[PDB]
């Protein structure tokens, strides 16, 4: 079962999942046992929290049960987080608004600007129309490529000069979208690094402006993070939270990498649905994120 996912995930399963049953193989359930399986979480980017409560749980119910040999600590863990992951298990539904509005937030990266794109063709596939504002206004390069993209996939990009208001973008893009009958509109935003109190101040009035077209506007707001780049994706994840309010959260690039573990992070830090992970350069390997194959896949053994 699960043979693509389980290839997607080939480095992450060395250290997690069916990586944890070399590690307990012969050994007995002791303290040391317990400090060697958290050195293993946190090198696979778990997170000190956390592995903090996924150990504290394992140590009492192994306890609590009398288990003698290691091996049964697999099956313990393998509910653990997979509950862990079920909790924020709940696919996106774009349906029946005027538009759908997404606002998409996040640092600067290949994964958000992909992210757009393959959402984009997804949405054109079930049927709905798109359309794409160029929010992150002081960027030139990013925003001609989303317009270059647009163009090559014939679908319209609100966009104005260089050093725009971000804010009015989107509004304008907004009101272009319901004048056209667009399904969904996706709004890109700023995502720079230097200065937090700026982009948190222009994302709260991105939002603010907004609701004078539409009071549910934004539907959805959604992080794009990379699980390639460890604990920076929950940093990420909790600046974005706190300023915006994150009702969504795509996570991408968990092929290839050792540290597909912090998808463990965010669920338990945030409690916000992923929505989306990606695990290939396809359109189609955007997957909507199913918890329960993402757990078998992880934990088991057979291909």
């Not at 350069?281 to 997957?287: Q, S």
């Amino acid at each position: 079962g699960f043979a693509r996912l389980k290839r997607s995930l080939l480095k992450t399963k060395e250290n997690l999942g069916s990586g944890f049953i070399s590690l307990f193989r012969g050994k007995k359930i002791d303290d040391d046992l317990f400090e060697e399986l958290e050195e293993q979480l946190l090198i696979a980017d778990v997170g000190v929290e956390t592995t903090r409560k996924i150990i504290t749980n394992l140590t009492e119910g192994a306890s609590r049960k009398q288990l003698r040999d290691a091996e049964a600590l697999y099956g313990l863990l393998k509910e653990e987080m997979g509950e862990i992951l079920a909790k924020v298990d709940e696919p996106l539904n774009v349906e029946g608004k005027a538009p759908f509005v997404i606002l998409m937030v996040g640092v600067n990266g290949v994964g958000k600007t992909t992210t757009i794109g393959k959402l984009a063709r997804q949405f054109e596939q079930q049927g709905k129309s798109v359309m794409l504002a160029a929010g992150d206004t002081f960027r030139a390069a990013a925003v001609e490529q989303l317009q270059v993209w647009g163009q090559r996939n014939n679908i319209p990009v609100i966009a104005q000069h260089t050093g725009a208001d971000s804010a009015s973008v989107i509004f304008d893009a907004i009101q272009a979208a319901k004048a056209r009958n667009i399904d969904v509109l996706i709004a890109d935003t700023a995502g720079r690094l230097q200065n937090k109190s700026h982009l948190m101040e222009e994302l709260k009035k991105i939002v603010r402006v907004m609701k004078k077209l539409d009071v549910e506007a934004p539907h959805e707001v959604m992080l794009t993070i990379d699980a390639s780049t460890g604990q920076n994706a929950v940093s990420q994840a909790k600046l974005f939270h706190e300023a915006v309010g994150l009702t969504g959260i795509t996570l991408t690039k968990l092929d290839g990498t050792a540290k597909g573990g912090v998808i463990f992070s965010v669920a338990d830090q945030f409690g916000i649905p992923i929505r989306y992970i990606g695990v290939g350069e396809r359109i189609e390997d955007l997957r909507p994120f199913k918890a329960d194959d993402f757990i078998e896949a992880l934990f088991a053994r057979e291909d």
